[model samples]
Target: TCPFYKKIPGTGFTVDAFQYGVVEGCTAYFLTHFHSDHYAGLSKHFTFPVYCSEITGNLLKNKLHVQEQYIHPLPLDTECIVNGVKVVLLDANHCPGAVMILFYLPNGTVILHTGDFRADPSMERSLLADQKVHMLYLDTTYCSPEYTFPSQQEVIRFAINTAFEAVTLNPHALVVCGTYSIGKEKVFLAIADVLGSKVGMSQEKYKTLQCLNIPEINSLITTDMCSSLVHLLPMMQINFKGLQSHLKKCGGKYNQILAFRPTGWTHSNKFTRIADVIPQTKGNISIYGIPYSEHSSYLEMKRFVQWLKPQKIIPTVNVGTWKSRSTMEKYFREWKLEAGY
Candidate 1:
């Protein structure tokens, strides 16, 4: 029963640390990002101070609404001790709060965990080239040849064209789409960047987006920038009926609205019910499915592994063993690893 299990724990899953009352100790735990898949179990059960970058800490506090005491902020690139283990947090470009961790043990064993990262050339150039790594816990979510994702630029173009087309087709209609409060802010900003205006966001999001300093995108009026827009709509209130009345007051000046949701939830019935609540005519409201994702694709994952050349590779975030474990084995074999966990 000591074989590595490639299955992720389900909602009701539980395991005792020691089956026969023997004590097992963990040196430390690091949360590379605030995504539910990585941090959900820790929110309720974990008591240790989880180490993360400063931005990740802000996201845990502001977006995930977690307590501050449970998070310890570590500066990027600087080696720090977390529960006696030397660790460093490197930027993971997958999302705003995402990070890649390097854990160094006193025994000269070094493990690098790429917590859902994508290959950004800028990140590769900034990495420490001289350090040797022994193991890597890789993210293999999209590790199949059949799954092909479009480039970020292509996806942005599609979203922009769809929004523009909606506005042209329905001049008098109020367009609305549902998105998460944090991640979708970028989509809105991309739209606003094309329109030469600032994207509207909740006060909390406004504060966070301010730090990014995106060119021209940050200069336009947000709800906070204009008190009139603030009063016309309250914070975190996406009421369709109230939005209709508010749109009427502006003489339908900006009739078309562009919104984004994570591709995973957009196809669900829950999202369909929300889309129905909007007042636009059935055909007038356009929903665009742009190939926008925060995780790396199969090719990106392979490229990352080839560059790092770690001794051992462990695949995390399993959907099924057949696909996940096999993908890890395939890549390790391609790299000619003698042995791995």
Candidate 2:
């Protein structure tokens, strides 16, 4: 579910879900994504039935080592029963297999829980999109104006162009586009196809990609030294001067190294702007932090929240947010009253 949860007044149902929402005396549990923060204290020893997208189920098994038998795969856009409540899953557009949850209560109350997501137009046509709602759970990741960012495609373009631009500046440089082993895979696949090169990663990441099973992307593997024309790694490497150490060790063999990370947080101070790349080449090696993310920007959230028009909105959070739920709700209420809907 979300970071924090409570019981519906006078109801036996309670979802204290997050990291390990596997609580007792409750209905089924739902998993939103494979991010460690969302499942930090979780394990295969869950006390209730766990529901998640198929990909998330695989991640729980292969990556988190959760025993497969306890997990239940919930298909997106379909209705199913959990205890006495009717539930459905919707594509979250956050990460592969991530989904938003919707619950139709018997008292004519509709609850929408956006596990974690960016805006998607199809959601407007979903069964509960236009329906009346008592309470709405929102992914308030970028709840503040300071966190606004450009669209996903534009950021991808920036990453690809930045990679090529770095190569053009110094063809001898080893191209390293920073990213997680799971997310930001498209950047590497696009670069591999667009620039005619092989991007490599850790063997574990290779297994992750292999599950995707696209022949064109079949060759991605774990090997930073040789046979890897371009390297894909965690964004942390580029953010903390870790790549500099690696390149410093490579010395003359690799004339230079170009590193870039695709994430939306790069726009912290500037608010939102047109899709563009800002390169920080001041360091010894040319490295960049791209503002590409799969979550909705503030403007997008405004439009989305208005369209759904719920009676009350619930804010989602994590430890990184640095704010309380009251503060988050107040900001949204102010935003809503500022303009119609």
Candidate 3:
């Protein structure tokens, strides 16, 4: 859900707030990425200057048809002044064009807004190592003890290995990967690379990939169904019915279907290990709910908060209501105490 308030507290900046119309007292508008949840309200009728990463800017113009004049794409880690406030864009590690915004106010307040990010060890070294953050606008999508998942590298390795094992047993198995318009490209790309398989995607998704200019995906993409056994599908179509229908459309080219549905929700507290989170099967079709999330997990968020040790923490996602918001804040407080801050 989008934040209830459009304006960033104590600043003249409005982030991801096109839905509320032109917010008063906001001088600059910033978009974190091209995700629909973040860029919900933006339209051609937008009236202010929007700042984002170069890829995000390109997608906004190409996909949404927003006027190019109003879009200002900022380079990563480069300092730029926006309406008298010093700002820098850092890679969010969530999606292709997503970024975590760092703001340096005239009054000397350092604010960091993480727009739906996955916190990795590599980010800790480069992201504001010298400076202390005053305020942190966090993406608390999985801000609970119940949701803990494995590292992305391990999960990708698991996906590739699992697919290989399944393929060796069933030689005619078609590998299907569930993905959004922008996310989870790495998982499928890695599988395709290791298996030396041609990948098939919808025309629109392929066009969007082209806009991002990823060279490897360009070489692997194919139009013919028979030629490509690996298919990248929309997230919603990973269910049993959808997989059955997809197999039927292939016209007997493939015998069994192995679908990899990657999401945070698949990670369960009930499972002791990553391997315990197993796959489901119905006849020839198999669905593996891989715990591959773009958002930070519970432990990751705790590590991030303790690592940064910001003076204040602001909740972004799952803050629509007071009860839900307080629950997330409780986790923050626990971490803060543990960090002795």
Candidate 4:
């Protein structure tokens, strides 16, 4: 039923969702991360057993709120049998709970899938010292030559600085930003740490922050009174009207607010006048655009491929045409093989 089965070229093997259904009567499913793309089809089409890192399992249940009955969790670097095939999970540095997967078949063929990852040296050290990887199913969302970003630490600092500046400029205005609820906790913590005092939050964000164990950042806030210090809500609620309602409810005690957004407003002309939704006041709301992307840049991907040096590299989750694949193939062909699906 898979459309790409024929295009796979060798062995005519087809992986169903996360499970590989080989012709020789064996099946293997390895989850690289808990992202919707990797896992969205898992709980629906496949019911046989699934393999992923312990942190990934916890993330599916705890952070993503997926049902526990769906996943079969395993420890990192530990090999386990699923329907008679050996699979292992490795730490992927894309997100806090992300992981890569490696499947070793009885025939000695190895398949490595790097879910979504940035080649963090720490992650490389952990993975290289731990196991051997063969064919790599890589993430090529940013495989084009144009994609690039600053260092992770630099991006984080820039995001924090933008938030702080937004708050400082409009001391009496309400600010809101959008970010994934659990994924971008580091950015939230960074903003809080910069504030020194507890950042004010709506009842929603306060409870969300409580779920995380970022104690060093937590202590910086006056936990006892976060309900009054900052307004924390999902990014969708960051419009001007929402800001006014929050300000009025807070008894106008504070006018300034800080928030983060996942999508860029500047990219779309439709969002040009969206800022008009907020009520006009003595203070103005400033939206900050900090390029804090979770995915690695094009250079990072090339570096990862160069260092790992897998036998084959397959890319997924891309936009535009497969032109990027051709580009990557040209770049990686000198060292090894490169393919895409």
Q: Best candidate, lDDT-wise?
A: 3
Worst 10 residues of 4 by lDDT: 5-14
**Worst 10-residue lDDT window, candidate 2:** 7-16
lDDT of model 3 at position 151: 81
Compose the digit string of candidate 2's lDDT tens values, residues 121-161: 66788876557877877887777777766667876676677
lDDT of each: 0.54, 0.68, 0.83, 0.56
TM-scores for every candidate against the unseen true structure: 0.69, 0.84, 0.93, 0.72
Off-target runs (Cα >4 Å) in candidate 1 are 1-24, 41-47, 63-70, 164-177, 201-281, 335-341
lDDT, model 2, position 121: 68
Candidate 2 regions exceeding 4 Å error are 1-22, 211-225, 239-241, 248-253, 267-277, 282-284, 318-327, 335-341
Comparing 3 and 4 on TM-score, the stronger one: 3
Candidate 2 local Cα displacement, residue 182, angstroms:
3.5
Question: Measured by TM-score, how close is model 3 to the native structure?
Answer: 0.93
Candidates by lDDT, descending order: 3, 2, 4, 1
- Which lDDT tens digits does candidate 1 get at residues 291-318? 5667676667666666667776777656
